[PDB]
Amino acid sequence: MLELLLLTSELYPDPVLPALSLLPHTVRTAPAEASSLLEAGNADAVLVDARNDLSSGRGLCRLLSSTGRSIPVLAVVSEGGLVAVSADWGLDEILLLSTGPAEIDARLRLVVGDQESLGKVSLGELVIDEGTYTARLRGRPLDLTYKEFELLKYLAQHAGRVFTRAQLLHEVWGYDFFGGTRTVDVHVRRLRAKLGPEHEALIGTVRNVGYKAVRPA
Amino acid sequence: MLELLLLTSELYPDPVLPALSLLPHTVRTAPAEASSLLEAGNADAVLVDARNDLSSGRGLCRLLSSTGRSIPVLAVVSEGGLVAVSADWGLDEILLLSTGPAEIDARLRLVVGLGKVSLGELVIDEGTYTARLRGRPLDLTYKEFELLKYLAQHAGRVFTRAQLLHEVWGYDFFGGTRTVDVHVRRLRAKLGPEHEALIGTVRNVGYKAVRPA
Amino acid sequence: MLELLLLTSELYPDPVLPALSLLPHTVRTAPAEASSLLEAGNADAVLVDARNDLSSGRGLCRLLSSTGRSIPVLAVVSEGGLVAVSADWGLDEILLLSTGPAEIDARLRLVVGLGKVSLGELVIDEGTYTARLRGRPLDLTYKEFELLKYLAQHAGRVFTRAQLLHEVWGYDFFGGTRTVDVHVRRLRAKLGPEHEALIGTVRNVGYKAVRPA
Amino acid sequence: MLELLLLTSELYPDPVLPALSLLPHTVRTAPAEASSLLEAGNADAVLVDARNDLSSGRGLCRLLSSTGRSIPVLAVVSEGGLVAVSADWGLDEILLLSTGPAEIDARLRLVVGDQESLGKVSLGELVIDEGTYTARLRGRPLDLTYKEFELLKYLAQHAGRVFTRAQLLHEVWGYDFFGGTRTVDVHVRRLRAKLGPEHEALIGTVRNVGYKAVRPA
Amino acid sequence: SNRLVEEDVLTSIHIEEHEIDARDTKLGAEEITRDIPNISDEVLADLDE
Amino acid sequence: LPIDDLDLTVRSYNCLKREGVHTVGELVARTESDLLDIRNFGQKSIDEVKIKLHQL
């Protein structure tokens, strides 16, 4: 779910903060220098190995907690280095190396929960902003119908995925109108009326079975 | 050097947090009552017990929360109970019942030791429960001020009637309301001809806020 | 963090499992069928009632099993019924009514916190519906991909068209169509002269996917 | 049933798992150290105690779950430390201290791998796997026609039963070609060849009745 | 007097034996195991393999 | 019985769902005193529910 960067003099997320490996979160590694601050990106927390370097660790906190770094900044420290951790660090939270899995889970939901979007996916031109319930395809918005917008994303987030209309029936109609699924074909028209040839091929047809979504290249 | 006020019926601070006696902070105890928040004097922080009961502990963390000014609120839960511990408690810091002495020291010395954003053409003043849309006067009813507030900060976010209902209202929540329709129709009227394009209302997606331009 | 589903006719989680009240993990209940797969949505765990009825729970776990990709499937028995608990149910854990709160929570965290394998010289991508063999480009459309995948997934399991209609097709079954023949010939031709011997025909009964080598 | 090496610096397994003496599992015991990693050998499953040392218990379960250790690993923990244990320790199953003996047997069977062989028919040295459709003899593939195999499997699955030609026609040559009994002998003549005399004892013939199969000693 | 029944003062134990004889046959031999054709579940509850 | 069968006035139905009343047993179990305290509750609603209690 959430992306983390681990600033460290070590090579793996296991010795620095082991309970991130006890989590299904994704943690990348980096050296403990300022250029690794250019490696954060669209992450949600950045965790400095300050378990040995307390002065240089707090310096990396001060460069991380500067003016416009909206990713909430973290350090991992020993228990005899927590006495150095104060308001002059500029940290958001603190995490011991002995911290549990669900403990780091709740601390991450307190420090996270820069407003990283949840359901904002971008399939090339197809920029499906489900936070706004709008999909941009080649810039101009898609003024599909209410249930047309749903179908497009269900084909999009299942890129390359072929299904029979019955399976599509469960993800568009659900438990309603089981027979006479033809309108999906008409609804493909309602999709292509607002897509055009630039991406009219992005919805691949599958004769006798259904359709499919094509990944642009 | 910190006065920590425990709202716990254990009659002793020891099973609530064991290692706190290893630190020379003072601890003043009382049962888990809201009236014992009037028992707070020069207390620097406050710990609530929620080790077996997450509900009344979270609500007491909530009872403290949003009151102001405020003294930061802490709680102690279990490790299998950290699922409910979230930002919705109004926490500033959460403690486990197995956090060390220097750990509690660091969390305390961190937590106990600005204006609004301008501007989407709808200023929010928290005093009279009213706003300002390209003009000083903007009358907002008890629920017609937070509805605009809810769509203000979550600008661009899509919220259904029920999704809006439980945060805009208490909520109860009643049904067959059109209170959103009664409000947004009204909230699209007192906003004048301009800024009628501040709320996105597409059919059956709910009522999203559309920010400019 | 999770929703738990109980396929039970007891209509209540605490007579089935007393500890499930003390955990804030919320449980929905459905009667003991496989069809209650339509009942579950974003629930990360589903349990099968097998406390009073053992072989019914074994059959329902057999129907609820590892197909894709897979959801955590659990089943609960008594102590003397622990002998019929085997791997052939389709499980990742076993639970008892004597299982505690922290025990149930930790086993759930074990199953939720593995990866499909598809190698025959033949890249198989269960979600991607992509195929490769002796080269990146091996165009596999839907009907032949799951088809071939079933064969490669069941390398050597002599398959007959009757066996494919209920798996590769839905099906009606629109059986006895010979369309497998043209489908396999495409699979034979498209896969090229090399790896064309994996999908070999065993007469009077159909085909089997010879393993490599 | 299982040769089990317990990882405890305590000498006895009964303070560790009190129910473990109640089963015939042979519990070798070795100190809670990394050097016991060399003493794995033919241990069925390894028993790592993390009732007390959860940090070094995590270390030992990581040690027994390294790149080439297929011996399944059990973390044996307290009830207030089960929530500290998850799939990060390289595990498939764990055991509490109040785990029952039938519960120990069940979870040990489940952590080892029950696993019954498919339609694997076995008649003396001739073992048939109808799945792959091989009536291999002593491991070498055997080459029958479509009918001989089904002829053979029927007798193989019904060894000892004295069948008749008329009887066997039905279930081998279906409902068709209803005359011409001697198709059996011409086929039997090939069966008795491609079986080899070394195991024609399986194939029995009684005059005036037909053919059968006999289980060898 | 029903005391005598509840007390079982006048009550009798009745042993009995059913003889089951499996013989040699051209069908084969009647292998007594729990390999039952078409058998439910509640009927095997008090049976050994 | 869930209160939904009462078919009282929509205000009464919603004005009882607001405070957490979900069954007629809990409603009639709330003594008559327990029922007038409801914030913003009309008396005619209380009369109709009282006659429903007594008769229904």
Q: B164 to chain A nearest CA, in Å?
A: 15
- How far is Cα B6 from Cα D108, in angstroms, rounded to an integer? 46
Across chain C, where does the E strand assignment appear?
3-7, 26-30, 45-49, 73-77, 95-96, 122-125, 130-133, 199-202, 206-209
Chains that touch B (3 or more CB pairs under 8 A): A, C, D, F
Which among C38, C128, C142 has CB closest to A209?
Answer: C142
Of chain E, the end-to-end C-alpha distance in Å amounts to 45
- Residue C212 identity (one-letter amino acid): P
Give A96's contacts in chain B (Cβ within 8 Å): 100, 103
Give E27's contacts in chain D (Cβ within 8 Å): 161
Note whether D86 contacts A21, CB cutoff 8 Å.
Answer: no
Selected residue of A14, A20, A21, A105 to mutate for chain D interface (largest D Cβ count, 10 A): A21
Instruction: Determine A/B contact with 3+ CB pairs under 8 A as the test.
Output: yes
Report the DSSP beta bridge partners of residue A210.
A164, A206
**3-state secondary structure (DSSP) of residue E44:** helix
Of chain D, the end-to-end C-alpha distance in Å amounts to 27
Report the DSSP beta bridge partners of residue C96.
C77
Q: B190 to chain C nearest CA, in Å?
A: 41
Between B and D, how many residue pairs show a Cβ–Cβ distance under 8 A? 4
Peptide bond into A149 cis (omega under 30): no
**3-state secondary structure (DSSP) of residue D198:** helix
Q: Closest Cα partner for C56 from C80, C81, C92, C22?
A: C81
Q: Which residues of B touch A (CB under 8 A)?
A: 79-80, 82-83, 85-87, 91, 94, 96, 100, 102-103, 105-107, 109-110, 113, 156-158, 200, 202-205, 208
Q: How far is CA A38 from CA A5, A33, A34, E42, F53, in A?
A: 11, 10, 8, 68, 71
* Beta strands B45-49 and A93-96, pairing class: unpaired
Instruction: Determine E/A contact with 3+ CB pairs under 8 A as the test.
Output: no
Phi/psi-derived region of residue A180, left when phi > 0, alpha when psi is between -120 and 50, beta in every other case? left
- How far is Cα A96 from Cα B103, in angstroms, rounded to an integer? 8
Q: Which residues of D touch C (CB under 8 A)?
A: 79-80, 82-83, 85-88, 91, 93-94, 96, 100, 102-103, 105-107, 109-110, 113-116, 131-133, 146
Selected residue of F3, F14, F19, F22 to mutate for chain B interface (largest B Cβ count, 10 A): F14
Resolution of the PDB structure in angstroms: 3.7
Chain centroid to CA C164: how far?
16
Alpha-carbon dihedral sign for residues C33, C37, C43, C46 = positive
- How far is Cα D179 from Cα D181, in angstroms, rounded to an integer? 6
Q: Which residues of C touch A (CB under 8 A)?
A: 38, 109, 112-113, 127-130, 141-143, 170
- How far is Cα C124 from Cα C138, in angstroms, rounded to an integer? 10
Output phi, psi for C35, to 5 deg.
Answer: -60, -20
- DSSP of C155-187, one letter per residue? TT--B-HHHHHTTTS--S---S-SHHHHHHHHH
**3-state secondary structure (DSSP) of residue A141:** strand
Selected residue of C20, C105, C110, C112 to mutate for chain B interface (largest B Cβ count, 10 A): C105
* Beta strands D120-123 and D93-95, pairing class: unpaired
Give A18's contacts in chain D (Cβ within 8 Å): 58, 88
C-beta atoms surrounding E7 within 10 Å: 10
Residue B113 at interface with chain F, using a CB cutoff of 8 Å: no
Q: A89 to chain B nearest CA, in Å?
A: 9
Note whether A18 contacts D84, CB cutoff 8 Å.
Answer: no
Using CB atoms within 10 Å of the CB of residue B10, give its burial: 0 to 12 exposed, 13 to 18 middle, 19+ buried: middle
Cβ(A57)–Cβ(A30) below 8 Å: no
Tokens for D97, please give them.
Answer: 């201290």
Q: How far is CA B120 from CA A42, A193, B132, B153, B207, in A?
A: 25, 35, 10, 10, 18
Cβ(A118)–Cβ(A79) below 8 Å: no
**3-state secondary structure (DSSP) of residue A105:** helix
| Total count of residues recorded for chain B | 213
The three-point CA angle B167-A118-A17 to 5° equals 110
Note whether B80 contacts D83, CB cutoff 8 Å.
Answer: yes
**3-state secondary structure (DSSP) of residue D77:** strand
Selected residue of D1, D76, D109, D150 to mutate for chain C interface (largest C Cβ count, 10 A): D109
Residue B80 at interface with chain F, using a CB cutoff of 8 Å: no
Residues 115-174 of B with CB under 8 A from F: 172, 174
- DSSP of B133-145, one letter per residue? SSSS-----TTTT
Q: How far is CA A96 from CA A14, A59, A90, B47, E8, in A?
A: 13, 19, 17, 21, 74
What is the widest separation between alpha-carbon atoms in chain B? 65
Tokens for B162, please give them.
Answer: 């029920």
Cβ(D172)–Cβ(D154) below 8 Å: yes
Note whether D161 contacts E27, CB cutoff 8 Å.
Answer: yes
What angle, 0 to 180 degrees and rounded to 10, lies between the N-to-C axes of helices D165-172 and D146-157?
Answer: 120
Q: Closest Cα partner for B202 from A123, A150, A203?
A: A150
What totals of helices (H) and strands (E) does chain A contain, helices first? Answer: 8, 11
Cβ(D51)–Cβ(D34) below 8 Å: no
Chain centroid to CA D181: how far?
41
- How far is Cα D128 from Cα F9, in angstroms, rounded to an integer? 77
Phi/psi-derived region of residue C91, left when phi > 0, alpha when psi is between -120 and 50, beta in every other case? beta
- How far is Cα B25 from Cα A86, in angstroms, rounded to an integer? 17
**3-state secondary structure (DSSP) of residue A151:** helix
Q: Closest Cα partner for B7 from B25, B26, B33, B27?
A: B33
- How far is Cα C78 from Cα C56, in angstroms, rounded to an integer? 14
Residue A128's H or E segment, with its range, is strand A126-129
Chain centroid to CA C123: how far?
20
Residue A113's H or E segment, with its range, is none
SS (H, E, C) A47-91: EEECCCCCHHHHHHHHHHCCCCCCCCEEEEECCCCCCCCCCCCCC
- How far is Cα A74 from Cα A45, in angstroms, rounded to an integer? 7
Peptide bond into B19 cis (omega under 30): no
Location of structure tokens 């930790």: C106
Phi/psi-derived region of residue D77, left when phi > 0, alpha when psi is between -120 and 50, beta in every other case? beta
Residue of A nearest to D88 (CA): A22
- DSSP of D22-65, one letter per residue? GS--EEEEE-SSSGGGTT-TT-SEEEEEESS-HHHHHHHHHHTT
C-beta atoms surrounding C29 within 10 Å: 19
Q: A208 to chain B nearest CA, in Å?
A: 33
- How far is Cα C100 from Cα B177, in angstroms, rounded to an integer? 44
Chains that touch E (3 or more CB pairs under 8 A): D
Which among A79, A87, A110 has CB closest to B86?
Answer: A110
Q: E18 to chain D nearest CA, in Å?
A: 28
Alpha-carbon dihedral sign for residues B136, B137, B138, B141 = positive
- How far is Cα D95 from Cα D45, in angstroms, rounded to an integer? 12
Q: Which residues of D touch B (CB under 8 A)?
A: 80, 83-84
Using CB atoms within 10 Å of the CB of residue A214, give its burial: 0 to 12 exposed, 13 to 18 middle, 19+ buried: middle
Instruction: Determine B/E contact with 3+ CB pairs under 8 A as the test.
Output: no
Q: How far is CA E42 from CA C52, C77, E45, in A?
A: 11, 16, 5
- How far is Cα D93 from Cα D112, in angstroms, rounded to an integer? 10
Cβ(D94)–Cβ(C110) below 8 Å: yes
Residue F11 at interface with chain B, using a CB cutoff of 8 Å: no
Contacts 24+ apart (CB under 8 A), C66-71: C66/C90, C68/C126, C69/C116, C69/C126, C69/C127, C71/C40, C71/C43, C71/C44, C71/C45, C71/C46
Between A and C, how many residue pairs show a Cβ–Cβ distance under 8 A? 22
Using CB atoms within 10 Å of the CB of residue B100, give its burial: 0 to 12 exposed, 13 to 18 middle, 19+ buried: middle
Q: Which technique?
A: cryo-EM
